[PDB]
Amino acid sequence: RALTPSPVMVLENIEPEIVYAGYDSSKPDTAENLLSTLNRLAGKQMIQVVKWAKVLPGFKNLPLEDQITLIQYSWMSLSSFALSWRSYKHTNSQFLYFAPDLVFNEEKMHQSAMYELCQGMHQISLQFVRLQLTFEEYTIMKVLLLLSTIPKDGLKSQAAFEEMRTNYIKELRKMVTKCPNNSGQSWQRFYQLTKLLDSMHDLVSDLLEFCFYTFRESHALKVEFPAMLVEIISDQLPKVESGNAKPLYFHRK
Amino acid sequence: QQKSLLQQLLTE
Numbered sequence: 001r002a003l004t005p006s007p008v009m010v011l012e013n014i015e016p017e018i019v020y021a022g023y024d025s026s027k028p029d030t031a032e033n034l035l036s037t038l039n040r041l042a043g044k045q046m047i048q049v050v051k052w053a054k055v056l057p058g059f060k061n062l063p064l065e066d067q068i069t070l071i072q073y074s075w076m077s078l079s080s081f082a083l084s085w086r087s088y089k090h091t092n093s094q095f096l097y098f099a100p101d102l103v104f105n106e107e108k109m110h111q112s113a114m115y116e117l118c119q120g121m122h123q124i125s126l127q128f129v130r131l132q133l134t135f136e137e138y139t140i141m142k143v144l145l146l147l148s149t150i151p152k153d154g155l156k157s158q159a160a161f162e163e164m165r166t167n168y169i170k171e172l173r174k175m176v177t178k179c180p181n182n183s184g185q186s187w188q189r190f191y192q193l194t195k196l197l198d199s200m201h202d203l204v205s206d207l208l209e210f211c212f213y214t215f216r217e218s219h220a221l222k223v224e225f226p227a228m229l230v231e232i233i234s235d236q237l238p239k240v241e242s243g244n245a246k247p248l249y250f251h252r253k
Numbered sequence: 254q255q256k257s258l259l260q261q262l263l264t265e
């Protein structure tokens with residue numbers, strides 16, 4: 001025998017690769033152009049996200065309806081978390097790396113008409129640097145975000161979901177023991193990481209509020225949304241605004 | 254149902 005491999009290696013394998021925004025820095029940085037570009041970018045990342053989720057250990061066994069529900073509830077969280085990861089790995093969290101050809105500095109944050117939201121997402125990137133987050137921890141946390149919110153009345157296969165989520169939590173516990181050592185700095189790190197996952201709920205709440213607004217006012221604001229997002233948001237918005245969503249917390253729940 | 258990008262991608 002040798003080691004007892006975890007899905008971690010598998011997760012690293014299915015990890016989607018960078019997608020370009022197709023942005024041209026020479027044209028005007030209007031809010032219309034920036035947000036429309038960002039929404040089209042999201043559409044492309046989303047295809048990768050679904051492809052990624054489809055082969056996830058455990059998640060792949062959930063019924064189609066629960067997989068769709070989970071993805072529609074967590075897409076913003078996944079997108080934002082991945083943004084902070086890229087910002088961390090590519091710029092040491094000095095900028096918001098939406099894509100290799102679309103990196104936001106303070107100036108673009110103001111022109112996007114999303115300044116405060118960009119700051120919130122940036123703060124997560126800052127945490128990644130303060131903790132020197134590892135790719136291993138990151139991939140498991142991504143899965144945990146996918147499993148971070150369910151319907152108020154639970155899923156179709158709730159019990160199976162709870163077992164899968166528990167396993168991924170234990171998995172994170174395994175990883176948090178790796179990177180460091182010194183029992184102390186593992187008990188502590190696991191706490192900080194799960195506390196960070198919880199903070200994603202508040203951030204996503206603000207992100208979604210702005211998202212639903214621009215979606216509703218899409219025509220008057222001239223903010224385009226790709227078919228991929230139109231479908232997801234059209235389904236997600238009604239549920240979220242009616243209080244059907246139930247965020248799962250690790251702490252202060 | 255018919256179509257739905259999410260459904261397609263998950264069963265492609």
Ligand SMILES: C[C@]12C[C@H](O)[C@H]3[C@@H](CCC4=CC(=O)CC[C@@]43C)[C@@H]1CC[C@@H]2C(=O)CO
Nearest residue numbers: 035038039042079080083098207210211214
């Ligand atoms: C959805 C928004 C545009 C775009 O979609 C962003 C999203 C924030 C998270 C995110 C990270 C990415 O790497 C690409 C796209 C994207 C997923 C943004 C929050 C509000 C903003 C808008 O509401 C513009 O209409």
